[PDB]
Design a binder for this molecule. Structure first.
Ligand SMILES: CCC[C@H](N)C(=O)O
Ligand SMILES: CCC[C@H](N)C(=O)O
Ligand SMILES: CCC[C@H](N)C(=O)O
Lengths: 320, 320, 320
């Protein structure tokens, strides 16, 4: 209902209804702007401090361009802070940003940094991507889906891959929408029960289904939208030179799609990586790989517009 | 007449009338904005993806500032793509840009990259400078000239220098305007007959004159505007340690200006380089070195406004 | 009264009345924008060329965001010029900038560069920070003060620290406002009498007081606002490994505050540096460390708006 000033570190602390709103706004903006083509200065007179711990181009591009499109001014900062060298405690740095940008999209290596960064700033902080989550992404993913099926009502998502931030986010959000989760990670990377125990709790209070395993073609069974993501995040070399060959046996391909439902569709946050998917799937007109990618922009805008304005979506809320 | 959505990779595939229009628009914008001083949000709500294979500051500055002046948002990308490292085929990268920026000004090392980049994107791509051409530059050059002589009607341009992208562009365009070309390159760097054969063809269907040689003071004979450009593009070291001493005997100076016509004027895309010109010429009030430089901005704007808007030039078309 | 087009290299050549105006405008903008919350496109259609000899993040952030907030377009340039490599004489470079940005905020290592850069450009040049001054900073400092005491009328400032650009600027300006200076630098770093001789002259024609010494707790005596700043600017290593231990005996702390007046307050341009101040002072609610920092933005805007517009401050001038 009201999101202005509410920083976004992860969907966990977010009522489905809230997330839904965002998506709505996203959809409002994408249409009102991309479809109807009008100019929306919602963000005129506002500045976004984008902190990038690691070169994350794509995200920026989208963000930058997005924040700008609404007439805002995206300010790009790399390691001028506690990312690379930094001589001051970010517990101060926040102050500055609190005075300069009126919102911060940060992409850091540790959630840890985020909460502090947030709790130490009179400015809403946005999880541009942490080691534990990636809200704004699934945010788009969902939007994308909703657009394709025109309802997230009760579709069952299918996760094939290692247990990273993404999957997590899904968990912290799939159920809120009323969607079914079907996770599948190698007996080595189950996601810290800390969260899963949570997802199962969300699923209970929503009536959604949830279950996970180590066998893919069992998570991508009745899957409406099967989702995957590289397991080789480049975390090491020894931890894949033979470690991620114990991770072998996943490489989502049509062999999977087959077991998948009929409505079946495919998601992935990019980039490519022939390791966990063949062109067969990835390029199948059933994969919303690119539209997913696109939406990142519309979502992030809405997100901002969400926390920086009193706006209010023109256009009837979509059916979720 | 209509240019919206038409990407610009080189004047080759461009009716003179079309180029003229651009110039016109340029002149419209420069006046309506720089002379009358009004603000023109033509580019409000639009974003430009500027890809720079190599640090090309000047060009950017102009572009950036230009695209911005019209209320657009220039997005600056370096090697986050298939310029330096890149893990994905640009045949996809284009997709992203097609979704993010609604136009791309790229400055690459190979035309090759450009066409593909263009043919693989629902977005107009602009030759920010390739190894084979440099449209937007001569574009300004021309504008500059037109301004100085108030007509390109039938002046004869004089080329003294190696046969690079620039000269090429001129070729692919001088005649369209009805101007005479007088090229002069060392018996080592004649421009691949592939293009010249073309220029001679354009000259035939326009009635313009065209001829080239290896003797400068013979190309800069009746020359109205003599144009030159560094031969030392920094392509090598061995290919100039003695190779470009076989290129000796050009260094355009007043000795040239003398043989030049009376209306005579001087062009050069910068930067300095005492190798192919003395301050005598370069700084002569007859050299439009700087105004040339300036125009880059007005032209590029028009170019954008050309492909991104339905605008329509207020102010009577200039006499070309 | 009129400042448009007047470049700002240092408060020296600036009537107090002029500086005051700026501050006023600053205060006008901060209020009209930050307090009343309206959007002010004063800088729409204008571009700022920001040259940074050395990575100066903070300053930029503020500037960038500021110039943008007023609807201007900040253009960020690093060493694409005579900062690092540069192949052309800046005496030309200026020309370009004169054609691209319609104003330049430069942060260089030598004043020297600035005057030339300025005298060679039909564009106002702004001292983003030189080795000799730092106008825009004290500019904020003053603003900050004025806000806290609601008058600079006749307070006595207290300088404890080495004799750098900052102190200088204060000197070149404190008296113009009618404030008392009380400098204190180690018997090794008195500021070149060249300037001090000047400050004493300004103090004479204003009736303000001025005196300096090498004993801190003697400059921060009746001090209303005591100001300090790191002595370790990182100029060397040998020049501090034992050289700035001969600089020992300053480290402004409450022991100082005590001798300070009652109205007493504390200033510092950041960053931290436990060498010349303990958290005791620095974090005392009597320190305007952060507000100082913030103001940098409002001031710089006003500065720009000052030299780029005919604006005119809505809201009664503050009492100085
Ligand atoms: C309207 C923006 C206000 C914000 N505190 C700023 O930094 O300017
Ligand atoms: C009006 C801009 C639309 C463009 N497809 C975009 O990336 O937003
Ligand atoms: C209104 C801006 C004019 C400036 N000479 C420019 O570079 O465009």
């Amino acid at each position: 209902v009201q999101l202005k000033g509410r920083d976004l570190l992860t969907l966990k602390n977010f009522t489905g209804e809230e997330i839904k709103y965002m998506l709505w706004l996203s959809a409002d903006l994408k249409f009102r702007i991309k479809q109807k083509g009008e100019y929306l200065p919602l963000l005129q007179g506002k500045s976004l401090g984008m902190i990038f711990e690691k070169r994350s181009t794509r995200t920026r591009l989208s963000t930058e361009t997005g924040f700008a499109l609404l007439g805002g001014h995206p300010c790009f900062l790399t390691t001028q802070d506690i990312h690379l060298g930094v001589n001051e405690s970010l517990t101060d740095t926040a102050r500055v940003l609190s005075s300069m940008a009126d919102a911060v999209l940060a992409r850091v290596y540790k959630q840890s940094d985020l909460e502090t960064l947030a709790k130490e700033a009179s400015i809403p902080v946005i999880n541009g991507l942490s080691d534990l989550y990636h809200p704004i992404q699934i945010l788009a993913d969902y939007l994308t889906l909703q657009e394709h099926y025109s309802s997230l009502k009760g579709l069952t998502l299918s996760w094939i891959g290692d247990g990273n931030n993404i999957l997590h986010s899904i968990m912290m959000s799939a159920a809120k929408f009323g969607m079914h989760l079907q996770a599948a990670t190698p007996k080595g990377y189950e996601p810290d029960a800390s969260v899963t125990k949570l997802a199962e709790q969300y699923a209970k209070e929503n009536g959604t289904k949830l279950l996970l395993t180590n066998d893919p073609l069992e998570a991508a069974h009745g899957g409406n939208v099967l989702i995957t993501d590289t397991w080789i995040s480049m975390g090491r070399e020894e931890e894949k030179k033979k470690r991620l060959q114990a991770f072998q046996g996943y490489q989502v391909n049509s062999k999977t799609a087959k077991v998948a439902a009929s409505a079946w569709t495919f998601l992935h946050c990019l980039p490519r990586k022939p390791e966990e998917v063949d062109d067969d799937v990835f390029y199948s007109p059933r994969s919303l790989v690119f539209p997913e990618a696109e939406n990142r922009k519309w979502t992030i805008m809405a997100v901002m517009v969400s926390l920086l304005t009193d706006y209010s979506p023109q256009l009837q809320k979509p059916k979720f």
